[PDB]
């Protein structure tokens, strides 16, 4: 998140840290939303390469433990089955994974609450982006948990010429743009927040930003519009 605050430590706790093997460590490289005890939604393009994964719930800083986290195994991925990671634009940027454990719940460990299926939000609602990813185009990620008001650029806008034009699809939700706030590498997967009627909800997965830069003018950050999906979500949780 560029331009971004460290948050609370309980502000989000269906955050998920989604880390895979490197060597005897263990690295970030995207977010998630814990939406189940046993499942975390994320985006496809992060499970592309066939890396041992695990998930951490309830962290806050990457760099320091502080006793609340709690670590499990993926056990299975169900990447959505019309993901083309060479088409990014395309859509369908979004995966399932199923914890090898389910995880204990409590301040800094929930279930991320998903909207009803084809909900679109009013041009400028709030949102918060949070996530570890990079503190500034072509930086490093975060230590701790950051967050960024971003409101949202409703499809007519952010489809525009002078936006993402035909890259933006009615299946994605774009938020801020202003130049200031942003996604970036490593928050991919993670969650968009909207507040609706008192409650926060998730609804994006962070999908992409612009080759040029994480806060690019005009090219707001790109989510996979979790609403679009509700179906195939408690498709494949049913099925698995």
């Not at 202003?178 to 009627?197: I, K, M, T």
Request: aromatic letters at 8%; glycine letters at 10%; hydrophobic letters at 35%.
């Amino acid at each position: 998140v560029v331009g971004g605050t460290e948050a609370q430590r309980n502000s989000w706790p269906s955050q998920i840290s989604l880390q895979y093997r490197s060597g005897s460590s263990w690295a970030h490289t995207c977010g998630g939303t814990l939406i189940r005890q046993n499942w975390v939604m994320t985006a496809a393009h992060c499970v592309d390469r066939e890396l041992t994964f695990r998930v951490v719930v309830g962290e806050h800083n990457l760099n320091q433990n502080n006793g609340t986290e709690q670590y499990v195994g993926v056990q299975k991925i169900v990447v959505h089955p019309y993901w083309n990671t060479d088409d990014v634009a395309a859509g369908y940027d979004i995966a399932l994974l199923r914890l090898a454990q389910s995880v204990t719940l409590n301040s800094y460990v929930q279930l991320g609450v998903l909207p009803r299926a084809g909900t679109i939000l009013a041009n400028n609602s709030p949102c918060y982006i949070t996530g570890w990813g990079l503190t500034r185009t072509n930086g490093q990620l975060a230590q701790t948990l950051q967050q960024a008001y971003l409101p949202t650029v409703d499809y007519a806008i952010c489809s525009s010429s002078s936006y993402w034009g035909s890259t933006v699809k009615n299946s994605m939700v774009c938020a801020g743009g202003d130049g200031v706030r942003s996604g970036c590498q490593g928050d991919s997967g993670g969650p968009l927040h909207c507040l609706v009627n008192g409650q926060y909800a998730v609804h994006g997965v962070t999908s992409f930003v612009s080759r040029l830069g994480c806060n690019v003018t005009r090219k707001p950050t790109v989510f996979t519009r979790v609403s679009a999906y509700i179906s195939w979500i408690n498709n494949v949780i049913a099925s698995n």
